[PDB]
Design a protein around this ligand. Structure first.
Ligand code: A1JC2
Ligand code: A1JC2
Ligand code: ZN
Ligand code: ZN
Lengths: 239, 239
């Protein structure tokens, strides 16, 4: 895919000292993320990541008049004693990263949004080790064994999707970039939370050690190398 | 259209003390705007404004990878002793306003771009009274009497469109709003130059007094009322 050779790709190394403070960046707003248990959602090992397909009615705004609907979420992760976030901060790679991918309400389908400015928006948070079992994450992680095989899927009860994200929606970096998988189309608005989410050591081990990918290989280290900013300026919602 | 009653319409009152400075807003880039004398350009009285069709090749960027092509320019103006700008600054209405309308390179057609975020971008500058005659604007103003009649049109020599704009391309306000005429589509990026351009009192009179609209009416005061921000924050490219 030729867009994988674009000048403005993701992910990137975030250098907060070079980030631009912009007070137009208000707290993110999420609506409908607190799901009932039924209907169930589909959790799939696609051989490259674990992805959770989201139902209609999850609305996200980056600001007034900047409205999106959530499509899916997926994870990026490393391996035993090796971090696997996609984004880095000052060259630091975090253990894992969650991405929640959204479609602008001006478009009915992803294929019309691809490459259009602000057509797609991704919410990204780093996952780090904390002392406690994260109960929202446990609902997904406890099902990975069921989908160990490449191309397998299982149904899971609806949960509070917003509980997979940090509680602080006010402090984030934002920049324009790309999908990180072919076709790497540009125009994607990336939002990366400052606050991280905490999983237990056991949870992080389940995530990195359970799933299999193409041809008898463990699905691990499933992150793209850092791409140059190439003159883009990362914005921050805080000085 | 009911879209004229949408929440994120244009024009607006700019309040510079409430604008958000974002250092990410780089100088505008306008290439290919210095047109040769041939081919000639269509200038047209549509009954609502005077419009100049622009050729292919006028490239405009609002930031890295956010590129546009100019389609047309048109003007908004008052009457004798009555200002007719669309935007206001702290309640002050300027004598007139120029709009240069552009299409995102991510969209092949205007009709696909209408209602999509960033599909269209308009460059807007205030016209004020100064002591000198303005050479750039004379090229257009001297041609108005030939098209005084609703629906009439004429061909004009190519001109340097960029010469119609203010001096410092690094100093502007920017927000997302709408077309200021039906269909009032949202998702339009408005960039409003901080500095103005100056015309003579005679030129201003030529602009406001020469053209005829529907009925046997003068074509005057062709500006929409100020619309609420509804929580939108206007950005500024300077502290
Ligand atoms: C196809 S996908 O859901 O897994 C996907 C990924 N997956 C990558 C995991 C790690 C890599 O080693 C290979 C594949 C991804 F990273 C982005 S990302 N990081 O750009 O957000 C995605 F958006 C989607 N899915 C997209 C969005 C839905 C749309 O239909 C196109 C594909
Ligand atoms: C009627 S018009 O074309 O002169 C016009 C345009 N042109 C657009 C029309 C819709 C799109 O399909 C292509 C571009 C425009 F962009 C704005 S604006 N301000 O939104 O940029 C206008 F105000 C006017 N004309 C108006 C008509 C009513 C009159 O009172 C003021 C001028
Ligand atoms: Zn991803
Ligand atoms: Zn206009």
């Amino acid at each position: 895919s030729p867009a994988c050779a674009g000048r403005f790709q993701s992910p990137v190394d975030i250098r907060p000292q070079l980030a631009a403070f912009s007070p137009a960046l208000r707290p993110l707003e999420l609506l409908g993320f607190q799901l009932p248990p039924l209907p169930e959602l589909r959790l799939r090992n696609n051989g490259h990541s674990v992805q959770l397909t989201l139902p209609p009615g999850l609305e996200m705004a980056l600001g007034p008049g900047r409205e999106y609907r959530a499509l899916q979420l997926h994870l990026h992760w490393g391996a035993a004693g090796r971090p696997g976030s996609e984004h880095t901060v000052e060259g630091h790679r975090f253990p894992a990263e969650i991405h929640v991918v959204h479609l602008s309400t001006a478009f009915a389908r992803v294929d019309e949004a691809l490459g259009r400015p602000g057509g797609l928006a991704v919410l990204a948070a780093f996952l780090e080790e904390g002392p406690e079992e994260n109960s929202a994450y446990e609902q997904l992680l406890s099902r990975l064994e069921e989908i160990a095989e490449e191309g397998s899927e299982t149904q899971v009860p609806g949960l509070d999707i917003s509980a997979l994200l940090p509680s602080d929606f006010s402090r984030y970096f934002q920049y324009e970039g790309s999908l990180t998988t072919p076709p790497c189309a540009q125009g994607v608005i990336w939002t990366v939370f400052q606050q991280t989410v905490m999983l237990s050591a056991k949870q992080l081990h389940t995530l990195s050690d359970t799933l299999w990918g193409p041809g008898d290989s463990r699905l691990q280290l499933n992150f793209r190398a850092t791409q140059p900013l190439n003159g883009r300026v990362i914005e921050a919602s805080f000085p």
